[PDB]
Automatic annotation (TrEMBL):
It holds the Pfam family p450. It comes from Streptomyces avermitilis (strain ATCC 31267 / DSM 46492 / JCM 5070 / NBRC 14893 / NCIMB 12804 / NRRL 8165 / MA-4680). Keywords: Heme, Iron, Metal-binding, Monooxygenase, Oxidoreductase. Belongs to the cytochrome P450 family. Coiled coil: none annotated. Heme b binds at H93, R97, R286, Y309, H344, C346. One of its GO terms (molecular function) is oxidoreductase activity, acting on paired donors, with incorporation or reduction of molecular oxygen. InterPro entries: Cyt_P450 (IPR001128), Cyt_P450_B (IPR002397), Cyt_P450_CS (IPR017972), Cyt_P450_sf (IPR036396). This is Cytochrome P450 hydroxylase.
Length: 398
């Protein structure tokens, strides 16, 4: 009775309807035969996201301890990523979040507005021809230039950063390519941390060095880990938020009219795209330290849990009868949890909201008649089971 997630993501819409159907705790199978539970309703996901019995520590995974997981399993990098803020809980996690919150503040993000506006303008200036891949030519570079600038990375490095990002986020990248790419990126982060210790500035890296709580502060390895994790977590997710907003406005032309006329604000388009069409369909992975009641099922001790943000974004219990439709005018008594909830909540939420909030009005200001150059039906998801990412976004600029 276990929903196997399509690893080609041939039909996300149906799979998300199946996951919602299979009740708050759905038995699922991950690409490569690996069974896990998925929480697929909003209220139950919130309860589990704040339950300290659901931990990131892979030692708690019974299937893994019993060697029933192949060491070459394509998703192993997600299930078992090593030491970061991502994979700790309790006091160790709260220390990291406290120090990181001192550096990546709402103020620091808001102060990027003008730089993001200039980067957005420079990318729009390079758009030529009647039909473009808006993903490749606009959405894809923007978050790389922004995060490089936020982090204070030497602007001399940007031509190589584009090649390293491409290699790191590509399916096609080999094995000894993928690890040469990670090594070169960590070298750039280490060079940045050492440069900012020698010459502190107005950048996230400088702020991560300075952060402290009662004389406690991040180690170099913790700063480099944090910067790498933010690139990995923040790049393709922000791209897909911008892509999905353009796709949603293209396919709902009367709501496009409302925002372009100024009736509706762009923030309402961004928040509705996050709920209706989150870039992150599933997050791996949590493990129960004890049996955990979820509705009228039990999540057994040592079992795995993924959070199905994609499925639960359209939860009728949270958002009502229209949950299944894109409506930027909707009011919900329940804020979307597409950035997560509880201790592991996304620290980049303000930044990705600002990037999309600047990019989208800038794009429609340059090209207010822009539409899809191919029917909505021909857009295809990439073969990435956790993410809601398209191969391309063909648009007629007009
Ligand atoms: C639309 C864009 C993005 C979405 C949809 C997204 C979504 C998420 C979600 C749902 C989580 C929590 C997963 C969970 O615990 O179940 C998360 C964690 C995280 N995100 Fe974001 N995110 C986005 C952009 C970014 C950006 C721009 C950054 C960094 C600047 C970032 C950095 C992180 C980090 C570091 C974590 C791990 C937090 C922790 O485990 O303590 N994300 N993200
Ligand atoms: C789980 C995650 C964060 C939440 C989110 O929205 C999307 C993802 C998918 C990619 C993950 C990332 C966290 C950091 C990971 C493990 C890496 O260091 C390489 C792949 C990357």
């Amino acid at each position: 009775t276990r929903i196997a997630l399509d690893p080609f993501v041939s039909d996300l819409e149906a799979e998300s309807a199946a996951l919602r159907a299979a009740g708050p705790l759905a038995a699922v199978e991950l690409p490569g035969g690996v069974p896990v539970w998925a929480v697929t309703h909003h209220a139950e996901a919130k309860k589990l996201l704040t339950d300290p019995r659901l931990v990131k520590d892979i030692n708690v995974w019974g299937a893994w301890q019993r060697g029933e997981i192949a060491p070459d399993w394509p998703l192993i990098g997600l299930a078992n990523p090593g030491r970061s803020m991502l994979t700790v809980d309790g006091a160790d996690h709260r220390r990291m979040r406290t120090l990181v919150a001192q550096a990546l503040t709402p103020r620091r993000v808001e102060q990027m507005r003008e730089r993001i506006t200039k980067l957005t303008e420079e990318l729009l200036d390079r758009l030529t021809g009647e039909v473009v891949d808006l993903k490749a030519d606009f959405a894809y570079p923007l978050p790389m230039y922004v995060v490089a600038d936020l982090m204070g990375i030497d602007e001399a490095r940007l031509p190589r950063l584009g090649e390293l990002f491409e290699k790191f986020f590509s399916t096609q990248t080999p094995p000894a390519e993928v690890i040469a790419t990670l090594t070169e990126l960590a070298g750039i982060m280490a060079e940045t941390v050492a440069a900012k210790r020698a010459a502190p500035g107005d950048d996230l890296t400088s702020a991560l060095i300075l952060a402290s709580e009662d004389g406690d502060h991040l180690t170099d390895a913790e700063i480099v880990s944090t910067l790498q994790l933010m690139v990995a977590a923040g790049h393709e997710t922000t791209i897909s938020l911008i892509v999905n907003a353009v796709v949603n406005l293209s396919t709902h032309p009367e709501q496009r009219a409302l925002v372009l006329s100024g009736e509706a604000d762009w923030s309402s388009v961004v928040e509705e795209t996050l709920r209706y069409s989150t870039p992150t369909s599933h997050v791996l992975i949590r493990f129960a330290t004890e049996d955990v009641p979820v509705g009228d099922k039990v999540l057994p001790a040592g079992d795995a849990l993924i959070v199905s943000y994609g499925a639960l974004g359209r939860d009728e219990a949270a958002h009502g009868p229209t949950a299944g439709e894109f409506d930027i005018t909707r009011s919900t008594e329940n804020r979307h949890i597409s950035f997560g909830h509880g201790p592991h909540v996304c620290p980049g939420a303000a930044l990705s909201r600002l990037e999309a909030g600047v990019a989208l009005p800038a794009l429609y200001a340059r090209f207010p008649k822009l539409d899809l150059a191919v029917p909505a039906a021909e857009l295809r998801n990439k073969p990435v089971v956790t993410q809601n990412d398209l191969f391309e976004l063909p648009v007629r600029l007009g």
